[PDB]
């Protein structure tokens, strides 16, 4: 199952891309974590390519 973490402040879960290992803010409204998750899965088009730098926090 795709790896997730909760940010230290507690306001945001992040999911790790199984290809590039960057952490992406978890898309809202997901019914489940998939077996593998990639930037390419992101409903947010700004964080859909592994080359996009990882957001802070
Ligand atoms: Zn990626």
UniProtKB/Swiss-Prot annotation:
<feature type="binding site">
    <location>
        <position position="39"/>
    </location>
    <ligand>
        <name>Zn(2+)</name>
    </ligand>
</feature>
<comment type="function">
    <text>Nuclear matrix protein which forms MORC3-NBs (nuclear bodies) via an ATP-dependent mechanism and plays a role in innate immunity by restricting different viruses through modulation of the IFN response. Mechanistically, possesses a primary antiviral function through a MORC3-regulated element that activates IFNB1, and this function is guarded by a secondary IFN-repressing function. Sumoylated MORC3-NBs associates with PML-NBs and recruits TP53 and SP100, thus regulating TP53 activity. Binds RNA in vitro.</text>
</comment>
<feature type="binding site">
    <location>
        <position position="50"/>
    </location>
    <ligand>
        <name>Zn(2+)</name>
    </ligand>
</feature>
<feature type="zinc finger region" description="CW-type">
    <location>
        <begin position="11"/>
        <end position="57"/>
    </location>
</feature>
<protein>
    <recommendedName>
        <fullName>MORC family CW-type zinc finger protein 3</fullName>
    </recommendedName>
</protein>
<feature type="binding site">
    <location>
        <position position="17"/>
    </location>
    <ligand>
        <name>Zn(2+)</name>
    </ligand>
</feature>
<comment type="function">
    <text>(Microbial infection) May be required for influenza A transcription during viral infection.</text>
</comment>
<feature type="binding site">
    <location>
        <position position="20"/>
    </location>
    <ligand>
        <name>Zn(2+)</name>
    </ligand>
</feature>
<comment type="subunit">
    <text>Homodimer. The sumoylated form interacts with PML (via SUMO-interacting motif). Interacts with TP53.</text>
</comment>
<comment type="subunit">
    <text>(Microbial infection) Interacts with influenza A virus PA and PB1 polymerase subunits during infection. Interacts (via CW domain) with influenza A protein NS1.</text>
</comment>
